[PDB]
Amino acid sequence: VNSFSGYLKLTDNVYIKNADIVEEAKKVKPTVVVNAANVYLKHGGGVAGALNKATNNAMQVESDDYIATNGPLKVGGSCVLSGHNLAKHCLHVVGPNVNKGEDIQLLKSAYENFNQHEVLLAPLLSAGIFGADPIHSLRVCVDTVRTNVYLAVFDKNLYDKLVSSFL
Ligand SMILES: O=C1OCCN1[C@H]1CCN(c2ncnc3[nH]c4cc(F)ccc4c23)C1
């Protein structure tokens, strides 16, 4: 039993809710919140910008030190950093950004990072300003992630479309 509330169950291990991931993280304080990161961990907009703003820029400060030490992530890769006031840990995962021409096949590699964590609160990778089709992202999620994932979808209209079209 866990504290996630109001989720629709899609499969054995995948759950979904129309929610602001920032507000959901603040309320649940999950072990892991996933950030929709880029390779430079520059959290300017979308989910990343919102998560970073909620940490009062502490996420960005920590991220800048990470990059200065380790260099950029790979598209499809991830790193574990602090969850600050939102979660124990933040798993920064880089999905391909279609608006930069990155290969959508890398979306499966991106979701594989979730399997290293038993339970996660996450957005749909490569959705929103990353330019992929969220219906496709949900399908890859369900077909790749085997651990327990609680997906937060900000847009109510999109949430209803994702549920209604789910096979
Ligand atoms: O949700 C969504 O509908 C439309 C597309 N799309 C994607 C992109 C945004 N993303 C999110 N997912 C879950 N929580 C979120 N909180 C946010 C706060 C912000 F300021 C900007 C983006 C998000 C967000 C999924």
Swiss-Prot record:
Domain of life from the UniProt record: Viruses
Organism of origin: Severe acute respiratory syndrome coronavirus 2 (2019-nCoV)
Protein's membrane topology: Multi-pass membrane protein
Reaction(s) the record says it catalyses: Thiol-dependent hydrolysis of ester, thioester, amide, peptide and isopeptide bonds formed by the C-terminal Gly of ubiquitin (a 76-residue protein attached to proteins as an intracellular targeting signal)
Subunit structure: May form homohexamers. Interacts with N protein.
Regulation: Inhibited in vitro by GRL-0617.
Function: Responsible for the cleavages located at the N-terminus of the replicase polyprotein. Participates together with nsp4 in the assembly of virally-induced cytoplasmic double-membrane vesicles necessary for viral replication. Antagonizes innate immune induction of type I interferon by blocking the phosphorylation, dimerization and subsequent nuclear translocation of host IRF3. Also prevents host NF-kappa-B signaling. In addition, PL-PRO possesses a deubiquitinating/deISGylating activity and processes both 'Lys-48'- and 'Lys-63'-linked polyubiquitin chains from cellular substrates.
Compartments it resides in: Host endoplasmic reticulum membrane
Ranges for domain Macro: 1-167
Name under which the protein is recorded: Papain-like protease nsp3
